[PDB]
């Protein structure tokens, strides 16, 4: 019972609060120089970022970049299947059992 | 690395205790990654989002009908006149 | 510039037509670039939703 909810609070504009929008704002639109900059860099052979190379030298363990449809969107993923180690003996602990009640060295 | 049952933020995610799942996603992950922004999401367009600029919209125009007025109006003084009595200004600036 | 414009659009209606076409072409090219950047942003938002 969470989807398609009713208007729970009121919507209003306080007197004389500014809007900062002119009358041609709807015709205004955004723009980024990033696409044009990338085109120009590719055409002029300008320095490329290392994200274009899938291998990652930023760590000692092997990482490979996974790209989401573009070189600008990538995530490094580790290749190793890391081996983990435990300097611990087995069968030396029973946490469910209350040990303060049993008589013995482990109890004390 | 001392109080594991009491420090759950430093513990593995519940998908790690499950023993089941080119390159694959890691099998072991911690909850401490929640304390990083770009741990799981990518850093795409990271230093390019503050570069999308939009210009202001103020127009400095106001008709100035002086034919309506026949009297002068008061005007402010913004700065002290340093072109006269320049040498004594630090000495008489505090008076009135 | 004024000569080259009046040489090809000597009348007010033609000047207005040319100005409107210029506006429309500018807006269309800007829209193409913005569509590309919007596809990128949409991918990033989808990855945030996935996270």
């Amino acid at each position: 019972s969470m989807d398609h909810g009713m208007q729970y609070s009121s919507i209003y504009w306080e007197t004389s609060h500014r809007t900062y929008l002119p009358f041609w704002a709807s015709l205004t639109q955004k723009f980024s120089w990033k696409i044009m900059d990338d085109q120009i860099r590719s055409f002029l052979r300008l320095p490329k970022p290392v994200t274009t190379e899938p291998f990652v030298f930023s760590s000692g363990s092997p990482y490979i970049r996974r790209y989401f449809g573009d070189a600008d969107i990538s995530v490094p993923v580790p290749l190793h299947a890391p081996a983990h180690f435990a300097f611990v003996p087995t069968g030396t602990v029973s946490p469910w059992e209350e040990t303060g009640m049993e008589t013995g060295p482990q109890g004390a | 690395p001392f109080m594991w049952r009491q420090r759950a933020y430093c513990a593995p995610v519940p998908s790690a205790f499950a023993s089941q799942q080119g390159v694959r996603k890691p099998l072991l992950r911690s909850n401490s990654e929640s304390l990083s922004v770009f741990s799981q999401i990518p850093d795409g367009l990271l230093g390019h989002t503050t570069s999308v600029t939009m210009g202001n919209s103020d127009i400095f125009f106001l008709p100035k009908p002086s034919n309506l007025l026949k009297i002068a109006l008061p005007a402010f003084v913004f700065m002290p006149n340093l072109t006269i009595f320049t040498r004594a200004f630090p000495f008489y600036a505090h008076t009135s | 510039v004024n000569a080259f414009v009046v040489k090809h659009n000597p009348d007010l209606r033609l000047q207005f037509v040319a100005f409107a076409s210029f506006i429309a072409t500018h807006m269309a090219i800007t829209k193409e670039f913005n569509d590309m950047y919007q596809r990128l942003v949409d991918i990033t938002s989808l990855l945030e939703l996935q996270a």
Binding site: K30 | T53, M54, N56, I59 | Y37
Partner: peptide, 21 residues
Amino acid sequence: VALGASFVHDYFYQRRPVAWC
């Protein structure tokens, strides 16, 4: 002159960033 100065002041000298989603 006022329109020219406003255009310049707004779109060359008073540009500020805006979020994009």
